């Protein structure tokens, strides 16, 4: 029995790859491979351009009041600021206008052959 | 971008996730897809923790132990980083260049995958 | 060495911190009523009785206490075995021993 | 007739009148070395020559008056022909209190203003309201302020609405000027030169050296140098009394690295002190004081209070006091405030001029109102009902 | 620059996680107030009294250089501050990051 090879290097060169955040784009915007076993015709063909959300529906339910509670089973300003609530709404629109994108970005892409597909295909 | 002030999940399983960033900027609450929960917990995230989270992708990135936590034991083995500077929300509008190559190879094998032929391939 | 238990290290730290109170150091000069002790009995000041002096006191800081060096102040990455006290280097551990270790010179 | 202001500090005593400027007094009597048999009173230590050795008589324990007899001694050299020449009988008195002052104190303070001295009407407040007062004065349109008020022997912070006082959120720290200068003497006793009978240069010291650091790592790596690139390190020189009768700091271009000179001039040698300190304000725990610092008791006094008022708090924070005087206090508290505050919320600190005599302006201030007389207790009101009605009245 | 403490185990200690850990050199003896991962790194590779090690202090990395009462034990400050240069060739580089746990291929081929 021997003790392991102890191999040092700089700690800057495993970080070689490493690249921040905000200086790579989103890779997942192509990624079709993916879609296999996760992402159906149905989900990408019917569905979808169906029920996608729009800005005026997600500003709507936004702006609305909570909806009323579930009926249960039956057996039958001094303090206040214009600037601060300015940038709340500011900040609330850029959240519904970023809620808007990346819902319309994770479902863009259509599977190259779905699930239904290699399900029929896939024998016993 | 910033330390761990607070992370407490909001129970309805979890409904959504508040977390609480610090930077020499201010202080900023924010309200977390339940789906970041399992990463945060991966990556062992907890109060005084440096990390990032993509808006996008709801990556986290746990990138050490802030510095003003360095002297709450007299050795621990782990990495002290400085607080981030700017404000706990960055924006960056970038233009980077990708060959139809980078596209071929990023979807001829599949990255990760929590399945055990996943993790043996 | 000898070691200290918690009740030393705890009474050294109340009676410098208790020195930093004092107003003079030396005696009068002239060498020829009461103290805050017996106005807080005498207040008879109980906590959680709405806002006093006792529930006024800060609370417990949240970031985590630096070690210093008992000798010339720098960080001192270094706790001595048989007091408790903080240092930073060889020469100071020295000093620490023979001026303020064990007994209190 | 006229107004008389007192804000009967532990340390300093802010004591003028309504129609005219104020003055810095010491409230502490004075024994020294060089007088057989004197005692010397408030502001009589000017006339002594050798202030090395100085014994301080102070009325003041942990900032609540302890010590009656000398008081009474300070006031009647401040109220005397001398000083003053105050007619009891037809003048009004706005003096100061300690926050959560005990009532058997309070109880002595009524009894000596409304019977030892008969004056015509007593308005005792905090120091901190006449600073609320005098901020709102200034500021018209704030609703709400935070009041620093780091003294001689505490450091209070209090929130103030328009015209009443957060008791609920007030919080201590106990670190002071006093807690400042016998660390200070601490360690130059242990390290350097004993100075622990040097009080008074010590103090002079800690005004003229010390100052507050933005960046303590970086400061305490560049004093741990040696050369010139030790740029935190100076030399002091203690005053003698024989030739040099003040303090003072060697310029850099005179400064020897090897220590040793041939005048011999007892020379004092700080390089970490300068920012040490200072900084037990800001971080108690350093010396070995379990208690937050000012910008986190700041926050903490501001996020017990409603959410509403919050942004209101943050953006008029006001620092008060001696220690407010140190350089780069302002710029410290102001980031370290942004940093913990919530970022939507704007932050803005505000230093004084003069923080010293921040209080005394807010008392002449109230004292030149019209509603000045509705605060007062009037003697005559006092016979029969003053007892209950100053705890009534004043809103200690 | 990295934080290297070398020194001779006296006391090791571990509590249900608290620890304390007290290292000596010929010249000073040093109490150390443990945390979760040194704890961890000192249980996995077993550590007892007497023992000479050296410990990486950001990564924990112990490695046991002999016992003493056989190596003799060091003798200047525990926690020493040093310069540590490396020169990494390119196909280096180019291999640790090629993929996880990439590195092997610099012993094994395989690259
Ligand atoms: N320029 C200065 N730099 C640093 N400290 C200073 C300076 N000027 C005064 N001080 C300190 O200020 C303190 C006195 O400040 P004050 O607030 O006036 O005290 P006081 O208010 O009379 O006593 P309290 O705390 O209200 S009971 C002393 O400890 C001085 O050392
Ligand atoms: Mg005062
Ligand atoms: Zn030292
Ligand atoms: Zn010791």
């Not at chain 3, 023979?98 to 209190?104: A, G, H, I, P, V």
């Not at chain 4, 001398?82 to 009004?92: A, H, I, K, P, W």
Request: glycine share 6%; charged share 25%; with cysteine.
């Amino acid at each position: 029995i021997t003790p392991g090879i102890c191999f040092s290097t700089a700690s800057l060169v495993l970080r070689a790859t490493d690249v921040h955040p905000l200086q790579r784009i989103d890779m997942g915007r192509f990624d079709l491979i993916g879609l296999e076993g996760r992402v159906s015709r149905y989900e990408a063909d019917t569905f979808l351009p169906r029920h996608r959300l729009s800005r005026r529906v997600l500003l709507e339910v936004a702006t609305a009041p909570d909806p009323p509670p579930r009926p249960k089973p039956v057996k039958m300003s001094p303090f206040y600021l214009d600037s601060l609530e300015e940038k709340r709404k500011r900040q609330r629109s850029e959240r519904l206008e970023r809620i808007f994108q990346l819902s319309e970005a994770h479902g863009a892409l259509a599977p190259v052959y779905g699930t239904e597909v290699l399900d029929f295909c896939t024998l016993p | 971008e910033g330390e761990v002030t607070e992370l407490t999940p909001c129970e309805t399983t979890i409904s959504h996730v508040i977390i609480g960033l610090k930077t020499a900027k201010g202080t900023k609450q924010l309200k977390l897809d339940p789906s970041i929960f399992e990463s945060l917990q991966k990556e062992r995230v907890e109060a005084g923790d440096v990390i990032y989270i993509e808006a996008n992708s709801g990556a986290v990135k746990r990138q050490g132990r802030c510095d003003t936590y360095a002297t709450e034991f007299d050795l621990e083995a782990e990495e002290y980083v400085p607080l981030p500077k700017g404000d706990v929300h960055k924006k960056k509008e970038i233009i980077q260049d990708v060959t139809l190559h980078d596209l071929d190879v990023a979807n001829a094998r599949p990255q990760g995958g929590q399945d055990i032929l996943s993790m043996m391939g | 060495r000898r070691v200290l238990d918690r009740a030393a290290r705890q009474r050294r730290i109340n009676r410098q911190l208790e020195a930093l109170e004092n107003d003079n150091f030396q005696d009068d000069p002239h060498a020829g009523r009461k103290n805050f002790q017996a106005l807080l009995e005498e207040q008879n000041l109980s906590v959680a009785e709405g806002p006093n002096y006792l529930t006024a006191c800060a609370g417990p800081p949240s970031r985590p206490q630096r070690p210093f060096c008992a000798v010339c102040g720098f960080p001192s990455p270094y706790t001595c075995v048989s007091c408790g006290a903080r240092y930073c280097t060889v020469r100071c551990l020295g000093t620490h021993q023979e001026t303020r270790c064990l007994k209190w010179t | 007739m006229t107004t008389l202001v007192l804000d009967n500090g532990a340390y300093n005593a802010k004591i003028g009148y309504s129609h005219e400027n104020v003055s810095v007094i010491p409230n502490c009597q004075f024994r020294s070395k060089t007088a057989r048999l004197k005692t010397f009173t408030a502001n009589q230590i000017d006339e002594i020559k050798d202030p090395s050795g100085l014994f301080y008589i102070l009325p003041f324990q942990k900032g609540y008056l302890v010590n009656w007899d000398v008081q009474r001694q300070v006031w009647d050299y401040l109220f005397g022909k001398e000083m003053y020449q105050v007619d009891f009988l037809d003048t009004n008195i706005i003096i100061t209190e300690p926050y959560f002052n005990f009532t058997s104190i309070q109880e002595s303070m009524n009894e000596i203003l409304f019977e030892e001295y008969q004056f015509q009407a007593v308005l005792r407040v905090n120091a901190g309201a006449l600073s609320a007062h005098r901020y709102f004065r200034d500021n018209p349109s704030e609703l709400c302020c935070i009041i620093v008020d780091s003294g001689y022997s505490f450091t209070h912070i209090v929130p103030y609405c328009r015209s009443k006082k957060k008791k609920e959120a007030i919080i201590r720290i106990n670190v002071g000027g006093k807690l400042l200068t016998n660390h200070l003497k601490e360690i130059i006793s242990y390290r350097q030169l004993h100075v622990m009978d040097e009080t008074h240069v010590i103090n002079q010291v800690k005004e003229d050296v010390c100052y507050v650091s933005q960046d303590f790592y970086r400061d305490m790596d560049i004093a741990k140098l040696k050369g010139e690139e030790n740029t935190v390190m100076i030399d002091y020189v203690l005053p003698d009394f024989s030739t040099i009768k003040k303090g003072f700091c060697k310029p850099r271009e005179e400064m020897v690295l090897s220590g040793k000179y041939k005048s011999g001039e007892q020379i004092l040698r700080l390089a970490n002190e300068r920012f040490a300190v200072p900084e037990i304000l800001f971080n108690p725990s350093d010396i070995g004081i379990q208690e937050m610092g000012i910008p986190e008791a700041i926050v903490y006094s501001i996020q017990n209070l409603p959410e509403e008022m919050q942004p209101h708090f943050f953006k008029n924070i006001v620092l008060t006091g001696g220690n407010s005087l140190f350089p780069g206090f302002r710029d410290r508290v102001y980031s370290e405030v942004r940093c913990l505050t919530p970022t939507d919320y704007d932050v803005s600190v505000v230093l004084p001029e003069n923080p010293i005599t921040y209080a005394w302006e807010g008392g002449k201030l109230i004292s030149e109102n019209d509603d000045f007389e509705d605060m007062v207790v009037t003697r005559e009101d006092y016979e029969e009902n003053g007892h209950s009605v100053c705890e009534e009245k004043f809103d200690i | 620059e990295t934080e290297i403490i070398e020194g001779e185990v006296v006391e090791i200690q571990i509590d249900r996680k608290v620890g304390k850990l007290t290292l000596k050199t010929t010249e000073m003896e040093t109490i150390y107030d443990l945390g979760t991962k040194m704890i961890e790194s000192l249980t996995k590779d077993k550590v007892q009294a007497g023992d000479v090690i050296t410990i990486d202090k950001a990564t924990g990395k112990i490695s046991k250089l002999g016992r003493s009462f056989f190596v003799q034990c060091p003798d200047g400050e525990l926690q020493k501050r040093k310069e540590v240069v490396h020169t990494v060739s390119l196909h280096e580089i180019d291999v640790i990051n090629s993929r996880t746990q990439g590195f092997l291929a610099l012993f094994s081929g395989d690259t």
